[PDB]
Amino acid sequence: HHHHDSPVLMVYGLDQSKMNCDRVFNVFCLYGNVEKVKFMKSKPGAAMVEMADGYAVDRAITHLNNNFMFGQKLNVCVSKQPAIMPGQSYGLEDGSCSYKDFSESRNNRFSTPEQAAKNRIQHPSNVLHFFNAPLEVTEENFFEICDELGVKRPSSVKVFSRSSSGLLEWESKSDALETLGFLNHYQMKNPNGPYPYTLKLCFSTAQHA
Secondary structure: OOOOOOOEEEOOOOOOOOHHHHHHHHHOOOOEEEEEEOOOOOOOEEEEEEEEOHHHHHHHHHHHEEEEEEOOOEEEEEEEOOOOOOOOOOOOOOEEEEEEEEOOOOOOOOOOHHHOOOOOOOOOOOOOEEEEEEEOHHHHHHHHHHHHOOOOOOOOOEEOOOOOOEEEOOOOOOHHHHHHHHOOOOOOOOOOOOOOOEEEEEEEOOOOO
16 A cells, blocks of 8 residues: 555654744745645644645655755655644744644745746755846845845855846755745835735756856
8 A cells, every 4th residue: 555645744853943834835835835834832843734735745755855954854754634723823932823824825836737837846956046036136135135034145146137036056955945944935125116026936956056
């Protein structure tokens, strides 16, 4: 027999101080639609993540298992529990909600076949591809954001000459993955529009920025 089918992942090795539901979404949304994230008081460093389907679970396991974040190995496994019930929510170490439902997030990337086709699913690398940044974005903007978030500045930034896109490179895969968790969907001032830009990040297969 094979593993019992399930749209729910168990992730172990999350940093108890630094991770929260939104930051988990920030990593896992690269691999499929994220429906729910649940931290459990009884299970330190672990979260259940419900994806849209079993295929998204397969993608997340294939790509994120055995990667490292904040000096810890991430272990991404199929959950024997195939649905998440909220239970009694609590505050995480940062005070944020232990449970979040992302089913209605505008930041899910695989909600339609046309949208899904514009995503490339790749392994974690030391290079992030950014999209939906302001037109006049510079390396300096990224440095300040990283400084303010308390994450490592990228060692190299390329802004490709609506919005800007480009590449952000760190010295290590762990640095980029940590920053992905913090920086994905960061809100940037729009000097010429009604809403700010939601910065969108993906992994790149480009060797360098």
